[PDB]
Design a protein around this ligand. Structure first.
Ligand code: HEM
Length: 291
C-alpha cells in the first residue's frame, strides 16, 4: 500500500493553527478531567495508539486513515479509555469539519505536548480518511507485562531503534494508569501534566518494589506513591536502554530533541509526502500568541 499525503483542499498553515488553538483553548478550559490532570495526557496517548498499529511490512495501519473512527479499532481492548480523548475532540471536528480524522487525532497529541510545556513537534497535514475496511485488526498494540526483548522486538515493527524507544517512553511522565482501563493503577511521577524528564529520574532514583495490584498484575511500586510497568522497568534491566535512561535523566534538552524527532516519525510512519508537499508546520502555543 502506498499512502500519499494529500493536503486538505485549499487549507494553509493559518488554517491548522486555528485547529491547534481550539484544541488548546479547550485543554485549558476542561481542566477538571481525571482529578485535575486535564486531557493532555490522554490526547498524547490517543496519538500514539492510532499511530502504533502500523506495520512496516505491508504498510497497513499507522495514522493515515483515521481508522480509529471505526468500531473495530475503537473497541480495541488496548485502547480502553481513549474514548475520552475522542469525545474531547468531536466538538473540535464539528467546528472544523474539513480536517481529516487522522490529521486531527495526531494534531491533538502535538498540541497536548506543546501546551504542557514540552518541545515543539513539527507536524504535517495530509492524512486521508480511508474506508472502514482498511481498519487494522486488534492486537497490534503492545502488552505491558513484558520485558526489554519484547519491547525492542515490538518497536522494530514501527521502525524505531533503541534511542527512539527510550525517548518515546519518557512520555510516561504524563498521566497515569487506570485500573478499569488497563489493569494497572497509579501515576509515574508527580508533575503529571507538565512535560519533563521526570520519568527517567524516577526510574533511576526511586526504591521500587514489585507487587501485584488489585487487578492481579504485577507492577513496580515506589514509596513515593508512583508506579512503573514491567515494560517501563525493563528500561533499566537492559544495558543498552539503561545508558539512554541515564542520558535523559541527565539532560532534559537532549531528551526533548530526541522525543520531538521520534514523536514526529512515529506519527508520520506509513505516509508518503510528495516533493511538492508543504514543509512541516511548527505551531505557536497559545502563550506565544498572547491568547
Ligand atoms: C511498550 C510500550 C507501551 C506500553 C506497554 C504502554 C502501556 C500503557 C498503559 C497500560 C497505559 C495506561 C492506560 C490507562 O489505564 O489509562 C499507558 C498510558 C499512557 N501511555 Fe503508554 N504505553 C506504551 C508506550 C507509550 C508511548 C510510545 C507513548 C507516547 C509517546 C505513551 C503514552 C502514554 C500516556 C501519555 C499515557 C497516560 C494516559 C492517561 O493518563 O490517560 N505510552 N501506557
Amino acid at each position: 500500500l502506498v499512502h500519499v499525503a494529500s493536503v486538505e483542499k485549499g487549507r494553509s498553515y493559518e488554517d491548522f493553527q486555528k485547529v491547534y488553538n481550539a484544541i488548546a483553548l479547550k485543554l485549558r478550559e476542561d481542566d477538571e478531567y481525571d482529578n485535575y490532570i486535564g486531557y493532555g495526557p490522554v490526547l498524547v496517548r490517543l496519538a500514539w495508539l492510532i499511530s502504533g498499529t502500523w506495520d512496516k511490512h505491508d504498510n497497513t495501519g499507522g495514522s493515515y486513515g483515521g481508522t480509529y473512527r471505526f468500531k473495530k479499532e475503537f473497541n480495541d481492548p488496548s485502547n480502553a479509555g481513549l474514548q475520552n480523548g475522542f469525545k474531547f475532540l468531536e466538538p473540535i471536528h464539528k467546528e472544523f469539519p474539513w480536517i481529516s480524522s487522522g490529521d486531527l487525532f495526531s494534531l491533538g497529541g502535538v498540541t497536548a505536548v506543546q501546551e504542557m510545556q514540552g518541545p515543539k513537534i513539527p507536524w504535517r497535514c495530509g492524512r486521508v480518511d480511508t474506508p472502514e475496511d482498511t481498519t487494522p485488526d486488534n492486537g497490534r498494540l503492545p502488552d505491558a507485562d513484558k520485558d526489554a526483548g519484547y519491547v525492542r522486538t515490538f518497536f522494530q515493527r514501527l521502525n524505531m531503534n533503541d534511542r527512539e524507544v527510550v525517548a518515546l517512553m519518557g512520555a510516561h511522565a504524563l498521566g497515569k494508569t487506570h485500573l478499569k482501563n488497563s489493569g494497572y493503577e497509579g501515576p509515574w511521577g508527580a508533575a503529571n501534566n507538565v512535560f519533563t524528564n521526570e520519568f527517567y529520574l524516577n526510574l533511576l532514583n526511586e526504591d521500587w518494589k514489585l507487587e501485584k495490584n488489585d487487578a492481579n498484575n504485577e507492577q513496580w511500586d515506589s514509596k513515593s506513591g508512583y508506579m512503573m510497568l514491567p515494560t517501563d522497568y525493563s528500561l533499566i534491566q537492559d544495558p543498552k536502554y539503561l545508558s539512554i535512561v541515564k542520558e535523559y535523566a541527565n539532560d532534559q534538552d537532549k531528551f526533548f530533541k530526541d522525543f520531538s524527532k521520534a514523536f514526529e516519525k512515529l506519527l508520520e510512519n506509513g505516509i508518503t509526502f510528495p516533493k511538492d508537499a508543504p514543509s512541516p508546520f511548527i505551531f505557536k502555543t497559545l502563550e506565544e500568541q498572547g491568547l
